[model samples]
Target chain A: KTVVVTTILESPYVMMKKNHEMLEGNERYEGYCVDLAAEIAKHCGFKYKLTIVGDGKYGARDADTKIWNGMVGELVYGKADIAIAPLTITLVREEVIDFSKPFMSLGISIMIKKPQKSKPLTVERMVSPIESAEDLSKQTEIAYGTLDSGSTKEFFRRSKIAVFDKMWTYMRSAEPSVFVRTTAEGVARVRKSKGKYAYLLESTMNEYIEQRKPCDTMKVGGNLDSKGYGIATPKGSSLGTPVNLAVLKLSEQGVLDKLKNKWWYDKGEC
Target chain B: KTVVVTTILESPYVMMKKNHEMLEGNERYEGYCVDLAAEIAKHCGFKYKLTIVGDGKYGARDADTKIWNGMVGELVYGKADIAIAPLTITLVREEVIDFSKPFMSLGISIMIKKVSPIESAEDLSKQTEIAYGTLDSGSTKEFFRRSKIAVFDKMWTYMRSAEPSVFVRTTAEGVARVRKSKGKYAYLLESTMNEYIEQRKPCDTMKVGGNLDSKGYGIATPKGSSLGTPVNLAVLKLSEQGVLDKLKNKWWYDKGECGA
Candidate 1:
């Protein structure tokens, strides 16, 4: 039986070949996620079909409406067995679904315009050998922000500190509306809003955006936290164990780094 | 003028000194935690006292009894200002108290009776990455078990998935037990514990153990600002801001190695 795999159209990771307009799913199968899913299925002895997440929005749960979208929705509604789309592993998401070992390492980072006076970002200062909840409470001129509707939003929402709450409060009460629904929208806002609006997103996406012209954005502050990108699947699904092992094997064989170089470095669209 | 600090009697980190038996409060201090606390206090410009927790147990809430213990309990009940001990940074503990970056590095491990014939107490047979768990199932073993719940229980309980529930009070005990028992029984303990005992006076014990399933330890402080949160943050932020430049400089300069 063919396993139905879901993916997204994010650049480099997934994009249609120029001549493949008439190509069906099998023929159009290309991209980091697509290839990864095929490799995983092969290792696990399963056949698969690659389908794009029906909705364009990234994974997020609406606070007001309590709705889910993007690949997470696909898993929630049982439309797919697993997702390999640079999906982030989060505490809230972990509560709902299981995740494979990280296929990629990333953190929440800021993106501002090149002309912006922001400094280089660091992963050290943000993550501490010791971290107190109160350190998160202090109010600073730096207006910390992230994408409005994804795991990033939920991470800060579920944060059990006054600092995160204050940061959330600041985002909720921004002057010209700061929250962007998607990372691309956030990056666009940062570019258009001059040095004022900073877009908080995955380091992977932020780095991609940085190489683009009119690169007004810079990753300010250090990475807010440390996390990795993992495969998302329904909780207690049989796919969890094998997928996790596959990620470990890939990591050991340096396949993960090879994939990153293939899709991120060599194919830099930015 | 006087800063109240919470601490515990975790050996090597914090221990009651016989020489300082007459000392009280701030006067009564010794061991790694005490020394580090003194250094941090001096760096952060604060004079402090070290007091043991009201409850003797380590920090963790008893689900059935609903009692809190250790420095975490002291902080929760507002009995102490800051905590400088070999306290672990767990989600359950973090829910009640705050923690600074780890001053020391240690991973949870397992300890076993020497003659049990079990190679490692945690993965006895590596049957399922499962084995008999730690002593205080909730505080340590549960953390290692990787269960959704914070604490361990018979119903929600699982064998040590990765040496999560291992235990040992001291390096000597761990070493003595392991040596006396041979490889029959194994102990799951922190790498630090295993490493420390391995380098001790007799040096007979060995860390025939594996890494615990999770993160490291930290210099724990209390929640809310009234107590030591501000002070703790000041110390941590200073550490983050390079206030401990001299300390770090000295770390590379000091080349003494511990055995085991």
Candidate 2:
């Protein structure tokens, strides 16, 4: 039976081929996930087709209908046999679908624009240096923000820890608004705000942006919280077992590490 | 048979009591190691005697005599059955002794006097205005000297050529140098020591940035010793029971004088 793998076009994960007009079917795209999908199929003894999720989301459940959306929705509705993307393994998503053991580990991190060169013969210091999440909550000189609706936002909202809960309180009520619609917009705000703003996002994306041209952004401090991405399938799907084993085998053989380096560093523009 | 445990006198680990002159045997010392020793002995069903190593050194092999010294030496020479101290597990030492799974995790860290400008290792490596060094005969020093990673290698290159000799003979000396040098010098040592010192009196020093590399401290016994397995199991149990965390709090934070 042919496995239909649902994924999204996220940079370095899945992306359109430069000559997409000349290609068709699975040949129309390539990325970390494209290569990973091929490896998983080869190992699990199945032929597979790559299809992008129509909604372009990582997947979240809607409150009104309790229905899933994006690649997760595709799996829940049986439109696809599995999801092969950088989909986070959240508690809500796990209720409707099975997730393989984490294939990649990441955490929320603070991203800041690189410090500009100091003026000659003048002492320079951060208005308020942020070494931990607590620093952000206590300091009002710099405003911080995260994506409006994603695991990151949900993470802060659900956090029980004092520092994180405090930060969430501030972000929820700040004047002039601190929430951004997307990671790109958050990063753009950081660059354009000079030293007045900071962006919070996943360390993987933060590090990726850090290495890109202009090199004007850097990940500050250690990650605030840890989570990972996993392969998703409908609950009790037989493909879950084979896919889980495939990921473990690949991780043990260092294929996962090699793929990460190939996409994140080898393809880096800066 | 009573296990002859060799340890060294180090603050917050194995330390002589204020009434050491009046006390006897293991009762004469107290600290994190003393408590850990008691728990290990109880769980492993052994009566152990605590004895300080004759040499104060943590252990290093002398090139001329090819003889090991300190607690590591005591274990290798059959002078002691085991060692429980802030003894780091290094590749070189692992060849002569068997170490249980690490009882505590730590890494090389930078200790700076409070108010210093240095915030990260990158900040230190990029400028000559400030200097940094590690304990002369410790794993941290060896880490930099043998490192091949770009940033560590660059830092090592800079440290080795530094004038007036940046290396200090002891952790105390390094801490003293940091205190006296104002913001001009930084000390590199294990995170455990840096943290403990950060809590002590005259607390003007703080650990800056994350660790340079990761390592751990382990209970050591002579290679092929029968006690290794049971001791390892006991450590795993204590760690899981939150005994290690409790001990750390007792020594590092509960008794912390400088305040959080």
Candidate 3:
């Protein structure tokens, strides 16, 4: 039986190839998750068809309908057998589907535009530096943000921790709103805002962006919180066991480490 | 009653002044701890006599005698009212005395000779090209001895069984070893001291990577000492007012003779 896998088109994770229109099947896509899916399928003795989630979201539940959307919806509705992407494993997601052990670790991080040399002199620049989340909360001049509809947003919204809750409260009520629809847009906002704005996102994405062209952004301080990405399968799906074991095997043999270095560092521009 | 403050004569923490012969009482020394003691005394409403720990050790319990040594011993034996040194707050010490909220935060850091190829502890662990060690009988060395984290435990295994001993008796000795090893050795110690040494003369070392573990140093008083609550509040108040940061600058940065 050919297993159907659903993923999102996130850069460096799953993305359409430069010549995708001319390509077919899995050959049309290439990235960290693409390679990872192939490895998992090989280890599990299954042929798989790769498809992108229709809504282009990581996944979330509709508050009104209680129906899950994105890849999670596809899995819950029996349209997809597994999700192989940079999908975060959160409590809400776990209640509907099963997640294997985390295949990759990441955390929330601050992404700031690299300080520019030609910028006008400012009191904030010389006197205060954004060293931690506390620093961000205490200052009002530089606005900060997070993705509007992902687990990151959900984390801040539902968190009970004082620091995260305070940040969320600020982002929720800030004039013009600090939330963005996508990671790319958030990053673009940071670049365009000069030193007046900061973006918060996963450290992995932040690090990846820091290495991209222009090299004008940096992940500063330690991660705000720690969480990881897991290979997710529909709850009770027989593929869960083999897939989980396969990931563990790859991790032990250092294949996962090599893959990360291959995609994240070997291909880096900065 | 005059409070007897026990502290060790670690450079930049508590040390003899250049003109020590002309000074007396608490004024006889000048360093980070001396300044800290003055602040804590003012906030806690006490006059303190700064006395150096006779043993000159941070504190450890002897296995055979079951006797605690150093500043911790001074507090337990009622030899001093409080310890205002870079005394790490550890479980063993906490059992015998009380610690104020951490006056300073620090952790195990890797210090390597400048221009050394080693960038992190992982680098040193992966190869014998560089040997690394911690100050003997200190919290750092004890951390490795008790560590269960995979990377740290692996390092512990290697260090414990190495042919030649890697541990040194003091921070000064560890720094000397790193400077003389010529890229052959790395010293693991508290980040505070590592950063301090990195700024001192003959600057040939740098701290690499984040700390291995998270810990802090606190003003320690004997268990149930009346000074605990007031001292703890004083640290909290001072931290909030940035007094601690200012004092740190005065000792670590303002007095730094070596240019980065």
Candidate 4:
């Protein structure tokens, strides 16, 4: 049986070729995760087949409807044995699947259009009130956004940090005026509206989008917390060990850095 | 002759007693550095004096007259034998003095008044468009906040992460601006400040400080590979054997976690 490996087609991660039908394992995909998967296969002594997750979401239960998507779905439904995307290892995700020591680090951030009036929020800013209750109340309409993933949504829901807690209070109590869904949707809302909407998403994706067209977005504030992507496998799978070692070897050998620069820094269209 | 030792009073690291003049030896001064000094002395077999540098500066060149200060001055002026404060290890300092393996890891960060509008320079520019930047004033500031210091200044400087150039002076100013700006301004400070401030009461603000330049603080010895190699390796060797970990806990840990 082929080692069925799950992947995604997010550009610079794994991109589907317009002519993918004409290529083979070595030629089909050629970006960071693709390279990473190839390296893992070589190191683990296994021949694998790459199949993209049918959906493009980061795996969150719908607030109104409740469903999962992206890599989360692949694992929940057992469609693949291993997942090697920029899949974040969040607390909620940890409950459902097993993840390796983080192979890559990233954080959630707000990507706003250039020339925003208020600065991006920092940990200090979030924890302390801004001058007075009135100052905070005025900014209370903070349209803090995030994806509908179980991890991110739960982060805001369970946050104890002053700023995030307040943001949660505001988001939970505000009229149908606050919160956002997809990162692109948030960026579009921020650009179309004034600096009123800040798109909240993974810092890497935010940065990637910032370099693209309508290049008016800017990532503000330090990341909410430190986290990393892990090579996820079904819970209690033996595959986790060899895959983790493969990641560390790649990390030590500079393959990860090369992959980041090639995909994140080098390939974006200016 | 005593192996003169220099340190700063940063608490958990070092501190002055209510009646410091009334004590002596291991009892007079106590903290992480003090304990480490004792262990090193015990291992190397040397009698040493724990003296606080007179001026309290981290050593810098006098721009007008050209002179160094603190432990850097102690070694340059031949007043002391070694320094084991949370003294940072940097290239310029290495040129003049030697350092042991890092006793601890730290990065530069800013401590804002929890009310500051600034997350970073990027945040400040994007938000208020304020022309605010890091303090270009003191030795610590100049070390981490400038492109280059004169050879004389370099000898006095002890900044490792200042290469990408970002720092500030007067922790007071960093905090004050953050409180007043209504989250419209922030400060560029050190991660130590963030951690230090968090432990204090009211816990009004936090370290939103990240993307730190990675480096460690070493026990600074006088230049000369003869003493340098052994000194550097000694710390590393102890660390590998776990002796260093035991000392760190004895000094830094109060009960459940570290104290401010």
Candidate 5:
């Protein structure tokens, strides 16, 4: 059966096609969520029509009357069968609707982005691939470090884990010395590295450093050694069970990872 | 009101008093849980008749039937007014009972007994369709129970209010669930148990995720019992004065049999 899907217009998540005037149906829009809705339909063995949320809100309950608005409102009002947008899975949302799954997470991530370049060639190629610990480790081009004699330094030093152990070796033996005297020095080093350096912490201070500026460097990857997202459906809907199954299956199949990389990085906008 | 209390015979939680043939009722028993119960009653200004759990089980509904058994069942069936054993706080448990603030493990971490690269709460929670469960009456489930966290709530909902119940009637049962499932199932329990189990043979299980969240084991009452408030107050009083800490040392470390 064809079902209605509630979504939102978040950049890279959903957007109208420039030639939308020449299109009539779903072709009028394209994005991460657009491709996701298609893949989910294929996996769950059901067809769906995508509709942008009416109120343009993600979701919330009213203080007085308790009415819901946004994509969540659309689900509450029975206007949509499932939500294929970046709708966060929350306790309040679950109270009203059943969720099929989750997607994308923010934790123990890395900080570095493609900065200004004067190259005539489109720089998406490989001027810098400093996104993950592995990416930073394989090359000496991008320098990285924490503090000298700092507790954060001990994370790599004490870690017996193979990936982290390799990184410590690279940082330890560097001739110029990657180790800094303080966090300020470490942050300053990366900013002045001209994108030649990346930074990793034992925790989330990288986010604050990324936040110190309005926007420039991008925080990429999962909890350095780890990872986290959700999918939505109306309460007690028949799709809840099979849709849930599809999500787990896709996760195992790595289809979820493929779609995320397709939009988030493949498009490659800083 | 002098109430009937349900408890269990777990080591350091409850142990037999010497010369039991001569003593009677509550005096015949001694342990951390018993002493804690005594202090709770003293502060609340009440009395109770302590009785051992009849079935020797902690609590879990049978897969073939919905009948709840063990200390949880005794309270559920109205055979006891309160349960002072180490019952895990759970969402389903709260449906038919009330609990005081937790008195054990101010925090809990992942208790995964796995080899699937399940290192964190987030990792195990997503390894769905693969099974994982917790002790039926204890603090670990409470982490998932009271959590508004997306990862925790997902795990809580998966175990409770879902088909094919994942709760175990005993920590032994939780270990058995992990050891016997051959990697299909993982178990969650207290830190002490994880510490003990890793030291024992068949070192297949491991605890990871550092600390997943905070939770506790609580003295429970039938829903809306008047005794709930005073009992909570007594717990707070004991916790504040370092009395609870003293008892913790006496039971957990002072006589601990496990070796490093």
Candidate 6:
């Protein structure tokens, strides 16, 4: 029997290819996890079928019934052999199932609904968030940068990730001096440009800035990802060890990092 | 009983603070973990005593003997109350001991007496003449055991039972072998220690290339101890408040001597 892989329908992870009506099987869906699933199977030497969790839930235990739902349910009930999704490795979920070491990490963040601030601006144009780094990259109305010749500058310039490469392109190609001379200047630009400029500083600097005078620049969306997601399998399954080994190997091989770029940014929306 | 802490004397984690000879008890030692023990005690509201692990192994099971040794042994045998060291969280250790989530993250790095020749792990993985290994009785050894990647698995195949045993028992022993081997031996260790050594005097060694695998260190305790739960929350709290990051920067970079 083909391996039954359970994953969630998260964008840039497992998404329906635009021309999905004609596609069949795995080709009908494509994203980071889709690519990662292929890599894991190739390394583990298995052919597999990818199926989204029927409930569209990441999996949770009922408060009273104590039955697991979603992907965790599939694994707990032994319907799915493996889960390849953005499932958080919480204490509860980990109790009932086995998870590989974190393949990717993330944290909770928020995006401001622009219409909440002012209705006039909402009626004028779509007010996108200055939330995640990608969210910033998707718009041109607001410009962001770090101090020139600084850590942040190099972080964008030297990164192999597509999002940073895109940011470097925007910053480096714009007048070369689009970045400020120093951090003070960068901070000044954020205030002077109103919401037009957002300084890309480390969380430490931003923390201090938030509690100081003229804290006009709110620490909005952190452009960084945190926490972790691991591949899941049923407890005591023989496949657990092989899958974990494949993930560790792929992570070491930097295929995990490369696959991230291939889906999240290479095939990303604006 | 005062919370007895078991740690190892790995530099920048737990070190004799120069004038440690005149000092005693907790004051006798200082380093990143020393500071961390205090923070953990303060947040958890308790008193503690710091003592270096006797026999000084992180923790490992003797293959045939089926007995634990090092800090893991101390806790398993009811000797230590808690372990606040740069001990790695591994599957074997987890089976007998409890570990808080990582306070600091690290990866296995290749420490070269020099660079420009052996740039990445692949160089070492492909070549046979140059020797490489990790500290004996640690997760680095376990890493090779379960690795599926061709290079790591190939490397492990040889390392599992190599003649003359490339695995060293301590970081000091490993580094000395690298320094004295005259380019013949390389030590594989966590990046934090590797980076710390790169800045120390007699700066003959350099840490080169991306890590072979990612792992981290955690505060450990006897399995199912009251100390485990509180210290666990305290670590997450301190981390969220940036105290862990702040103290880490202070010890590793802010106090740099060789100008890192």
For candidate 1, state the interface root-mean-square deviation in angstroms to 1 decimal. Answer: 14.0
* Model 3 stretches astray by more than 4 angstroms: A118-129, B1-260
Tens digits of per-residue lDDT, candidate 4, B210-234, equal 6334345678877663455445545
What lDDT is obtained when candidate 5 is compared to the true structure? 0.67
- Give candidate 2's whole-model lDDT: 0.80
Model 6 Cα lDDT, one tens digit per residue, B8-87: 99889898988988888899898899999999999998889998877978888897898999999999889999999998
DockQ of 2: 0.03
Steric clash pairs (candidate 2): none
What's the C-alpha lDDT at position A107 in model 3? 75
Q: TM for chain B in all models?
A: 0.70, 0.92, 0.94, 0.74, 0.67, 0.94
Top of the candidates by DockQ: 6
Better of 5 and 6 by DockQ: 6
Candidate 6 overall lDDT versus native? 0.74
- Per-residue lDDT for B213-234 in model 2, tens only? 5456789999899998678778
Two-way TM-score contest, 1 vs 6, winner: 6
lDDT of 1 by residue, A68-129 (tens): 77888778878788787878765456556776656666666666555522344443232221
**What tens digits encode model 3's per-residue C-alpha lDDT throughout A1-70?**
7888899888799878889888999999989999999899787788999998767888888798898888
Model 2 residue A48 CA deviation in Å: 26
Please compute and give the TM-score of the first chain of candidate 3 against the native first chain. Answer: 0.93
Q: In TM-score terms, which candidate is top?
A: 6
Report the lDDT tens digits of candidate 5 across residue range A68-174: 87777779889788888765444456568765434443334556654654465565443446556776677777777765543345446655656778888888887
Task: Return the TM-score for candidate 2, rounded to 2 decimals.
Answer: 0.53
Off by over 4 Å in 6: A1-11, A18-102, A105-270, B160-163
Q: Model 3: clashing residue pairs?
A: none
In angstroms, the error of model 6 at B178 is: 1.7
